[PDB]
Amino acid sequence: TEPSEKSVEIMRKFSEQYARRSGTYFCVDKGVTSVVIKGLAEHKDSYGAPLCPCRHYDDKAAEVGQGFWNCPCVPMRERKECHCMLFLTPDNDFAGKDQTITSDEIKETTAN
């Protein structure tokens, strides 16, 4: 289902400051950024925590409690590995120049 506006804005603000803090950049295609941000928001709405939208889980409540895949996940925090392509290191071929993304960009690129 569609995530709440408020959770999307939570996860948008998070993405901006975390990209800045980690020295990473959003994908050249900000549709990819926007889709992942909405997945984080949807998981926050449904499970109580922004579990990685590019992982499959058995027991959601146990994954929320243990926290390994709660964004920013352990591979991102420790190795700067973001397989969702939300936070891209500057050497990555699909890293763009932006560490910001507006609500309008999120809505435009995910309208379809």
Place this chain on the structure above:
Amino acid sequence: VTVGQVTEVDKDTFWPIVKAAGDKIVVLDMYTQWCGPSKVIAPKYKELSEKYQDMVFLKLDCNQDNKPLAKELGIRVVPTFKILKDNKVVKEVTGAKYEDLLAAIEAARS
């Protein structure tokens, strides 16, 4: 299933299609609604289905409704691709790695 295109399947329609495939190889794209890289590789997956018209290309949304089939097939990374021959999974490819998927299709055909 129309071949030359990608057919959406669910937990009830997937295995009968595999059974009906006969000697055709089946490819399955296991995706979720909000995985960015899934959406990146999806058009390339469609082009593979238009090239490999002697194979059956499927996609499965790994949501709550389809979780029993997701659990049976096995998935941790999104995307995950499965290649099936003769009623079983023979190969998997994890991630949105187009060249890895291509190489696995080519290996399965050899």
Place this chain on the structure above:
Amino acid sequence: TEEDEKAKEKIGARVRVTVPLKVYHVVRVPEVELMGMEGFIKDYVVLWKGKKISANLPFKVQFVKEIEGRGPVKFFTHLKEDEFELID
């Protein structure tokens, strides 16, 4: 599983990192190369309240690294089994 049981038995064991691995979370150390560093397994976590979870770097390993002008800096890094060897 036997794998989980034998992994839990390695808690406390000394290990050496056997592959190139850069980490970025060590406080005030922007980048640390772990290959060749020795530490010990602090935890192995694949269960939470008895439910199996899907963490793919299940060994939490404690390291201490000497930093010039700072002394020893203790930190943890999550590893999987093919990234380290038991020391004994």
